[PDB]
Design a protein around this nucleic acid. Structure first.
Ligand SMILES: [Mg+2]
Ligand SMILES: [Mg+2]
Ligand SMILES: [Mg+2]
Ligand SMILES: [Mg+2]
Ligand SMILES: [Mg+2]
Ligand SMILES: [Mg+2]
Ligand SMILES: [Mg+2]
Lengths: 133, 153, 56, 164, 48, 46
RNA sequence: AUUUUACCAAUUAAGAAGAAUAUUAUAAUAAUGGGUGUCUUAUAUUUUAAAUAAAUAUUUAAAUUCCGUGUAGUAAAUUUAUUAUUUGUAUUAUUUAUAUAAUAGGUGUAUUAUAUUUAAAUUUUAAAUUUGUUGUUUUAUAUUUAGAUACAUAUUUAUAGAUUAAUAUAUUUAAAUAAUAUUUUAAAAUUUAUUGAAUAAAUAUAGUAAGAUUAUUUUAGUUGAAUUAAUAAAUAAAUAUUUAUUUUUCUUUGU
């Protein structure tokens, strides 16, 4: 007769898999077909006062991460739109093309806001009589 | 709620909970619904039809009240079912504020007509004031067609 | 269907009286029309298959 | 809990309850005391054509001139049936009749005295009886209307002969 | 346009007034209970 | 919470052990089966 | 004088209105709790409160933050609106029975290996688990019928670098802008209520125990390796899918 009917299921976030942890630790570099995820070298460790008195050894250099970890992270990005092999994986950091395509679709051709990086641009100068109860 | 209450009462009173035709018929007859009529809470503390003779002067000759037209005009009308409308001095209309709400509200549980507020069409075509679900005005199709054709658009 | 033959099925189950008005009549589609011919059966006579009245 | 998966439809209660229509047509048929809104609506509509005609005032409604009571008093409707076996070809002193359940001994004796002229009535023995029940060819249970049995006693034995 | 659905049985007078609609309903219900034209039943559960 | 059916017709059809009840008692001994005799009524009375 | 050895064989046309205002979505115009076999009155027929709910929302940035559980008016009464029995069987699609039964009087053998008729010759059934791959564990009477979801694809309008921690710098070649989903049955009692341990909800969730997962006749690589927590060291190996290097040589060689 009548029971609990199932409705449409909401989709996940388009940038759900990309992690701020990765965006803070690593960064992507290189040509499009030879991208490498690199993080700064050195050993991070907290020790007592009086250790590593010489600073010349501590170097700020970037070394690439292991290829298996790079493949795992890239696959985490590749999760979205898996069936279309003709679509290149997403990027660790969103680019200008991505921010533009976020609203360049024809379903956003009427909205004046959200266009040309409204959320990215700093706010406008508010009115001088601006006040809230 | 009332159905379950009546079922429990009949089970405790006259139902043996056996396969007898008595209980077999009770289990189906108790599902029937009784009359519902919104009974306004009576006010024994203040009788509204009693204040008719209040705040009125009287003629010393005949020893009866004076029909003051100003009082008759400014009299506030309180509603009640057995006493459809009652005039009362405006100084005492404050104590009868809840009767006003109970009369303005539709004499029906809100969940019976709640199907009105759950759609945009009825939300726009109906009124929601003191829980009074009375339909607003709505032009006929002939009327709106005539209006638009007279307006030439 | 463009042409629903009376013996075909369309949102309906096979009912004998509804799908076969006359058992001796066979319905075909000729020139975009329902033509109702007499039903014939094939019998072997003189080494060839002759058509005889099916009901008879 | 995943509430967003469902749409907004009230599911049916489990276990589902039976319709309030009494389906038993036996000896122990019960009259439902619960009053329904449709009953009052139909009563009012047959009384004064609700809602087309304005309601008569309370005086006429509660008076003896209200149409139903006036018609019941000036055109009474009482179904009195005589049993042919009780008085056919036998001089019986206790003929029996069938009446509606709303009648009494005094009602029946006044009926027979005023309408049919049977004044010599000694005593009326009252006994209710459930309506006759039966099944037709297709098996539908149809019960006849209820009737009250009365056994009236006369001073002289009566008989209606059947000319064979 | 129909004021009542097609499966509703018409219980009204020839003029159109519903003065005795309940009277006609009761008459039809009595006819359904015991029709006057009822012949000789075949059921083993006979009324008498 | 169980129901008791003394003798009911099997899957293939009603047998003589139930037709005996159908002819003597008037209906099947379970009562759940409604007596339907329209066919024999048409064959005899009509 | 009566007088025919024992054993060995078979599911097929279906006779009947015993199939329909039939099942499931689909209607954006109604709605005070439906109860017919009903039917006097109501000191006895009252449910309301500023929150996420029968009202359900067009993005991928940044940003609080010890797995970032996240996107804003497109129009201001503007046309995404909770619709329903007939002025089309409402239309358009989809699905559907489990009553009814004559069938053959003998092909292999007759001191005992298991269908193919010249006599023999062959075997103990399958699917899962056991990685010390069994002789361990568990299931299967048969007939018919239900039974489990990663898009093998991209034609002319057309336009696509990076990089600093940051302020910055920009003398290097491309591209088919498309997202939605992702086994099944189960391994557990806490939950939210109701009625006097039962009742009704929870595909809620178990680092996840265990099993089942429907489609022959096919066309190319390894059969016991790899194993370095953590400052500037050429490189983990197997299995599988796609995909690339025709250089010498006396023959050979899966990089
Ligand atoms: Mg994130
Ligand atoms: Mg990898
Ligand atoms: Mg043999
Ligand atoms: Mg059949
Ligand atoms: Mg509406
Ligand atoms: Mg199957
Ligand atoms: Mg390989």
């Amino acid at each position: 007769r009548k029971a609990r009917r199932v409705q449409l299921q909401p989709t996940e976030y388009l940038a759900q898999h990309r992690m701020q942890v990765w965006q803070l630790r690593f960064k992507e570099m290189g040509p499009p077909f030879s991208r490498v995820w690199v993080a700064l070298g050195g050993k991070m460790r907290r020790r007592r006062v009086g250790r590593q008195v010489d600073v010349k050894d501590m170097r700020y250099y970037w070394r690439p991460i292991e290829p298996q970890y790079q493949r795992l992270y890239m696959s985490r990005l590749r999760i979205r739109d898996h069936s279309n092999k003709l679509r290149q994986p997403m990027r660790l950091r969103a680019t200008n093309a991505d921010i533009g395509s976020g609203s360049s679709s024809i379903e956003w051709e009427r909205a004046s806001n959200r266009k040309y990086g409204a959320m990215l641009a700093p706010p406008k100068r508010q009115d001088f009589e601006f006040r809230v109860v | 709620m009332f159905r379950v209450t009546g079922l429990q009462l009949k089970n405790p009173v006259v139902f043996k909970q056996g396969q007898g035709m008595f209980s077999h018929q009770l289990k189906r007859l108790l599902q029937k619904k009784s009359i519902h009529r919104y009974n306004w809470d009576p006010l024994p503390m203040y009788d509204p039809r009693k204040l008719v003779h209040a705040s009125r002067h009287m003629d010393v000759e005949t020893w009866r009240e004076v029909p003051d037209p100003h009082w008759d005009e400014r009299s506030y009308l309180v509603p009640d079912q057995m006493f459809y409308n009652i005039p009362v001095p405006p100084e005492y209309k404050d104590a009868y504020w809840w009767r006003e709400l109970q009369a303005r509200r539709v004499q029906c549980p809100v969940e019976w007509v709640s199907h009105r507020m759950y759609n945009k069409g009825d939300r726009q075509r109906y009124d929601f004031q003191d829980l009074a679900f009375r339909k607003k005005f709505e032009f006929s199709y002939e009327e709106v067609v005539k209006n638009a054709k007279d307006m030439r658009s | 269907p463009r042409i629903l033959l009376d013996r075909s099925l369309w949102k309906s189950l096979w009912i004998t009286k509804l799908q076969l008005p006359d058992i001796n009549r066979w319905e075909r589609v000729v020139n975009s029309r329902r033509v109702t011919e007499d039903r014939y059966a094939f019998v072997e006579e003189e080494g060839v298959m002759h058509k005889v009245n099916w009901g008879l | 809990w995943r509430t967003w998966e469902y749409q907004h439809t009230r599911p049916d209660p489990r276990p589902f309850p039976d319709p309030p229509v009494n389906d038993y047509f036996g000896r122990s048929r019960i009259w439902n005391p619960i009053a329904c809104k449709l009953g009052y609506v139909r009563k009012k509509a047959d009384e004064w054509g609700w809602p087309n005609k304005p309601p008569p005032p309370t005086g006429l409604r509660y008076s003896q001139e209200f149409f139903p009571f006036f018609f019941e008093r000036y055109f009474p409707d009482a179904e009195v049936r005589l049993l042919l076996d009780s008085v056919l070809n036998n001089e019986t002193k206790r003929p029996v009749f069938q009446i509606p359940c709303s009648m009494s001994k005094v009602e029946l004796v006044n009926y027979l005295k005023n309408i049919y002229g049977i004044d010599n009535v000694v005593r009326v023995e009252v006994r209710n009886r459930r309506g006759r029940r039966y099944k037709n060819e297709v098996g539908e249970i149809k019960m006849m209307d209820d009737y009250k049995v009365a056994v009236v006693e006369l001073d002289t034995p009566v008989s209606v002969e059947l000319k064979q | 346009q129909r004021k009542l659905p097609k499966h509703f049985p018409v219980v009204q007078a020839s003029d159109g007034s519903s003065l005795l609609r309940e009277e006609t309903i009761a008459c039809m219900e009595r006819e359904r209970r015991l029709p006057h034209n009822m012949g000789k039943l075949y059921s083993y559960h006979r009324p008498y | 919470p169980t129901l008791y059916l003394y003798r009911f017709p099997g899957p293939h059809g009603p047998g003589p052990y139930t037709m005996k009840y159908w002819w003597t008692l008037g209906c099947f001994p379970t009562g759940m089966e409604v007596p339907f005799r329209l066919h024999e009524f048409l064959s005899t009375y009509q």
